[PDB]
Amino acid sequence: IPRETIPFLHLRKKTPAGDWKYDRQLSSLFLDGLEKAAFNGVTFKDKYV
Amino acid sequence: YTDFENTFQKTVEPVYQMHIKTSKDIAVLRSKEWFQLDDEDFDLLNKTLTFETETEVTFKNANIFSSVKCF
Amino acid sequence: PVMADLNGGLQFVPELKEFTAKLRKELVETSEVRKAVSIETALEHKVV
């Protein structure tokens, strides 16, 4: 993820003032999860929906 | 008889139990001058306390006491 | 369109719900404690 650019998909974190801003760490979590899903796939066993 | 200066009395009170629920109870108990805890920082909250006291009294007349000591 | 903020800086207090609940409980506790202590002192006076 380049320095000073927002990913096309990202997560946001609420600031003390209460506005939702792009969060690098949370978005990294999300995008790593997506990467794993694309390569190894992801199981939803035992999930009721 | 009316020689109350020679009279006295001693009664072993029934044991009394109190469940300290709220901070109100703690505050009220700490207000009573007679309620003395050795550990001033004891946590009375959600504690059961039992009081076993004895009262020694002398008399001034049939209706009034001239000295009261509960301990 | 115009947006007018007539909030008097309240938005700058963090965790507003907890702050106001703390204020309210402080007041309620002080009131209840004082009332209970006063009642008990009066009753002790009335018995002694």
Sign of CA dihedral B41, B44, B46, B48: positive
B29: tokens are: 């108990």
What resolution (Å)? 2.1
The structure's method of determination equals: cryo-EM
B23 contact residues in C (CB cutoff 8 A): 29, 33
B61: tokens are: 């007349």
Classify domain B1-71 at the CATH class level: mainly beta
With tokens 């963090």, the residue in question is C14
Phi-psi region of C25 (alpha: psi -120 to 50; beta: other; left: phi over 0): alpha
A23, burial (CB in 10 Å: exposed 0-12, middle 13-18, buried 19+)? middle
CB atoms within 10 A of CB B46: 9
CA distance A12 to A26: 7
C41 contact residues in B (CB cutoff 8 A): 31
Q: What is the largest CA-CA distance in chain B?
A: 50
Helix-, strand-, coil-residue percentages of chain A, each rounded to 5: 35, 15, 50
Which uninterrupted H or E stretch holds C24? Answer: helix C16-47
Q: A14: which residues sit within 8 A by CB, 6+ positions away?
A: A20, A21
What residue in B sits closest to C39 (Cα-Cα)?
B28
A49: tokens are: 């929906």
